[PDB]
Enzyme design. Structure first.
Site, PDB file in Angstrom:
ATOM      1  N   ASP A  30       0.701  -1.396   0.095  1.00  0.00           N
ATOM      2  CA  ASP A  30       0.049  -0.008  -0.038  1.00  0.00           C
ATOM      3  C   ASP A  30       0.943   1.272   0.114  1.00  0.00           C
ATOM      4  O   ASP A  30       1.978   1.455   0.819  1.00  0.00           O
ATOM      5  CB  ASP A  30      -0.885  -0.042   1.246  1.00  0.00           C
ATOM      6  CG  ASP A  30      -1.766   1.107   1.456  1.00  0.00           C
ATOM      7  OD1 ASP A  30      -2.516   1.460   0.454  1.00  0.00           O
ATOM      8  OD2 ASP A  30      -1.578   1.931   2.285  1.00  0.00           O
TER       9      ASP A  30
ATOM     10  N   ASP B 176       1.022   5.209   0.602  1.00  0.00           N
ATOM     11  CA  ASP B 176       0.186   6.349   1.097  1.00  0.00           C
ATOM     12  C   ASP B 176       0.950   7.426   0.886  1.00  0.00           C
ATOM     13  O   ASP B 176       1.539   7.853   2.003  1.00  0.00           O
ATOM     14  CB  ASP B 176      -0.063   5.958   2.538  1.00  0.00           C
ATOM     15  CG  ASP B 176      -1.106   4.999   2.752  1.00  0.00           C
ATOM     16  OD1 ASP B 176      -1.460   4.314   2.065  1.00  0.00           O
ATOM     17  OD2 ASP B 176      -1.397   4.893   4.157  1.00  0.00           O
TER      18      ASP B 176
ATOM     19  N   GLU C 248       1.198  11.046   0.838  1.00  0.00           N
ATOM     20  CA  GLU C 248       0.280  12.293   1.112  1.00  0.00           C
ATOM     21  C   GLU C 248       1.081  13.602   0.951  1.00  0.00           C
ATOM     22  O   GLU C 248       2.136  14.057   1.817  1.00  0.00           O
ATOM     23  CB  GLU C 248      -0.030  12.149   2.558  1.00  0.00           C
ATOM     24  CG  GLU C 248      -0.779  10.902   2.888  1.00  0.00           C
ATOM     25  CD  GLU C 248      -1.444  10.633   4.418  1.00  0.00           C
ATOM     26  OE1 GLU C 248      -1.613  11.793   5.075  1.00  0.00           O
ATOM     27  OE2 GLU C 248      -1.571   9.625   4.476  1.00  0.00           O
TER      28      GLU C 248
ATOM     29  N   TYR D 273     -11.795  11.361   5.506  1.00  0.00           N
ATOM     30  CA  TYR D 273     -11.795  11.921   6.893  1.00  0.00           C
ATOM     31  C   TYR D 273     -10.813  12.938   7.077  1.00  0.00           C
ATOM     32  O   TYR D 273     -10.101  13.343   6.119  1.00  0.00           O
ATOM     33  CB  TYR D 273     -11.455  10.669   7.988  1.00  0.00           C
ATOM     34  CG  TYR D 273     -10.456   9.845   7.583  1.00  0.00           C
ATOM     35  CD1 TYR D 273      -9.177  10.124   7.484  1.00  0.00           C
ATOM     36  CD2 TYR D 273     -10.903   8.503   7.225  1.00  0.00           C
ATOM     37  CE1 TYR D 273      -8.138   9.311   7.026  1.00  0.00           C
ATOM     38  CE2 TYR D 273      -9.914   7.514   6.846  1.00  0.00           C
ATOM     39  CZ  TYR D 273      -8.339   7.792   6.637  1.00  0.00           C
ATOM     40  OH  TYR D 273      -7.243   7.029   6.429  1.00  0.00           O
TER      41      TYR D 273
END
Ligand SMILES: COc1ccc2c(c[n+](C)c3c4cc5c(cc4ccc23)OCO5)c1OC
Length: 575
Positions: A290, A292, A294, A370
């Site tokens: 995965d 991620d 950001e 979120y």
């Protein structure tokens, strides 16, 4: 017949062999601490003091011959290599023309990082996690954090593994620029310097080897001399218990994303993709990767990084290149490997990647629905809402309006549906999107009733600062509280409010809040009702399922609601 071999247990290292060498009472560079071997070297000493020794030995595991060699007089060392981890009953036989004689059987252990030598993990799950028969096509994911084993005291055997399909292990760092890690304070940046000593930039490493593989967990039966320990040995035993569970390392995250901005250079992608292949060959319990980052285009932790023009095409190339590498591993192992990514869902994050191009390489996209509003500023709002709240202004939801100063909104407001519809409209398949649920709240203080422009809605107020609290209340950083803290300190068992808080729900947005009108403490979170809304929304649009950040913060209520809101549904798993 020859004298029967007598196995020297102590000087065959009481028959514990491992394919992985892990450094144990030290913290050094990853390449000095971790060394993986495709074949275990098995050396077993035996002696034959009386009688004739014979000519040749044979070693058997569970009655099948696995090695042969020459007898050397009175003391021999059987040396051979073996690929398959496991627990075996070993016998050693000595042979000559007169006959053969065999030792008593003894258990040999060959450790490997798929956990083939381990029994199923004994669990210790909060009983408030309930049983469901959710269809196995539906994704029910969560993040388990490596540092959760310290103050948060949440270990792998606490996870409600029968209620999860996917566990994302947060987070594996990338060696290189990592200034953002200093924002967490503590020893996190220094620990990464140590891990990266002697490691090439842009290669993955384990951030905390104590948590990952050194620490002994008595509940898992670990001893100080056990060759693999920590959270990784517990995840290997968890995979023996629940073999269809997918466990995926998550690379990056908010604090660990700074090296991704240098992936505009293909050379650094190639160094990274090779290091991931090597990582998944070393840690065999993992089932994919995965990513991620950001975020492509910036707006993450590093204020001085982000390239709107070039980061998207670098992210797409990374995904292309990782799927080429994973197909190499599938050919080598016969296993299936998944490639996933957690992404921002604000319009200004989605516009920087052409997801219609990236997603063809991916199994799932974990949409981070979120952190829409939070204590980083003093503007209340719903941090994890599906839809636009009552607090928002005319034209704020779609971005066609102007704000209180008359300035145009720059894009659609931050809600889960605005982001999911922007991904769907460019052709991302619904069945690859996994909707995120929050197991925490974000909050403010100072939101007193006199600051509200609509008296019925505390989201129209103004804060003075972040919520403050203690770690026993689930406040590990100002402005953020564990859901199980909100339940113990603000909701109560009946969900009607304690300690001066009242509960409310924005039925338009699908978003709960608690508010103490005296202190002005206001917290935006997900609860049973809003998680049932998100599951109904996922079923209506044919999304892959739901995931959550972060499992240690739930008391069971949020994962139960994830299952309850998906009841009856099935989905087509991506090919
Ligand atoms: C590691 O855990 C997390 C997870 C998400 C965040 C975070 C820290 N900050 C500052 C923000 C954040 C900060 C912002 C923002 C938006 C933000 C959105 C998410 C996070 O708007 C401007 O300031 C964090 O802690 C380091």
């Amino acid at each position: 017949a020859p004298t029967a071999p007598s196995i020297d247990m102590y000087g065959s290292n009481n028959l514990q062999f491992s394919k992985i060498e892990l450094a144990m009472e030290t913290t050094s560079g990853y390449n000095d601490m971790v060394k993986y071997h495709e074949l275990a070297k098995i050396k077993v000493k035996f002696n034959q003091w009386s009688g004739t020794s014979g000519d040749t030995y044979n070693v058997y595991f569970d009655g099948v011959k696995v090695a042969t060699g020459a007898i050397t007089g009175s003391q021999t060392t059987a040396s051979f290599e073996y690929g398959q981890g496991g627990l075996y009953q070993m016998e050693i036989e000595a042979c000559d023309a007169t006959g053969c004689s065999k030792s008593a059987p003894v258990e040999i252990t060959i450790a490997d990082t798929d956990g083939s030598h381990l029994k199923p993990l004994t669990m210790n799950v909060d009983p408030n996690n309930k049983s469901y028969n959710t269809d196995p096509s539906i994704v029910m994911g969560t993040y388990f954090v490596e540092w959760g084993i310290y103050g948060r005291d949440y270990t792998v055997d606490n996870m409600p593994v029968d209620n999860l399909t996917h566990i994302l292990y947060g987070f594996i760092p990338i060696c290189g620029p990592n200034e953002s890690v200093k924002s967490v304070g503590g020893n996190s940046f220094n620990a990464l310097q140590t891990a990266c000593r002697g490691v090439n930039d842009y290669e993955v490493v384990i951030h905390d080897p104590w948590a990952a593989y050194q620490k002994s967990f008595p509940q898992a039966g670990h001893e100080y001399s056990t060759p693999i320990k920590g959270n990784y040995a517990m995840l290997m035993a968890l995979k023996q218990r629940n073999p269809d569970l997918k466990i995926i390392p998550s690379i990056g995250g908010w604090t660990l994303s700074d090296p991704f901005y240098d992936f505009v250079d293909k050379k650094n992608r190639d160094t990274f993709v090779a290091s991931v292949k090597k990582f998944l060959k070393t840690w065999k319990f993992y089932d994919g990767v995965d990513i991620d980052w950001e975020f492509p285009g910036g707006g993450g932790a590093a204020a001085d990084k982000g390239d709107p023009v070039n980061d998207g095409p670098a992210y797409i190339a990374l995904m292309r290149e990782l799927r080429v590498m994973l197909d190499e591993l599938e050919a080598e192992t016969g296993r299936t490997y998944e490639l996933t990514s957690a992404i921002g869902v604000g319009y200004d994050k989605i516009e920087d990647v052409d997801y219609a191009d990236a997603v063809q390489y991916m199994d799932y996209i974990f949409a981070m629905t979120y952190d829409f509003y939070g204590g980083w500023n003093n503007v209340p709002g719903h941090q994890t809402a599906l839809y636009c709240g009552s607090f928002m202004r005319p034209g704020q939801c779609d971005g066609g309006g102007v704000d209180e100063n008359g300035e145009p909104y720059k894009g659609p407001a931050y809600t889960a549906d605005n982001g999911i519809q922007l991904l769907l409209a460019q052709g991302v398949p619904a069945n690859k999107l996994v909707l995120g649920t929050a197991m925490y709240g974000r909050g403010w203080e100072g939101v007193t009733p006199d600051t509200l422009t609509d008296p019925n809605d505390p989201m129209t107020g103004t804060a003075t600062g972040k919520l403050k609290g203690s770690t026993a209340q689930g406040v590990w950083e100002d402005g953020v509280i564990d859901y199980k803290g909100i339940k113990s300190f603000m909701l109560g068992a009946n969900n009607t409010g304690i300690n001066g808080f009242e509960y409310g729900y924005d039925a338009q947005a699908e978003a709960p809040w608690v508010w103490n009108r005296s202190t002005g403490e206001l917290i935006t979170f997900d609860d049973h009702r809003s998680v049932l809304a998100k599951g109904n929304y996922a079923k209506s649009l044919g999304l892959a399922g739901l995931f959550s950040w972060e499992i240690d913060a739930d008391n069971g209520d949020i994962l139960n609601a994830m299952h309850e809101g998906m009841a009856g549904g099935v989905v087509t798993p991506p090919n």
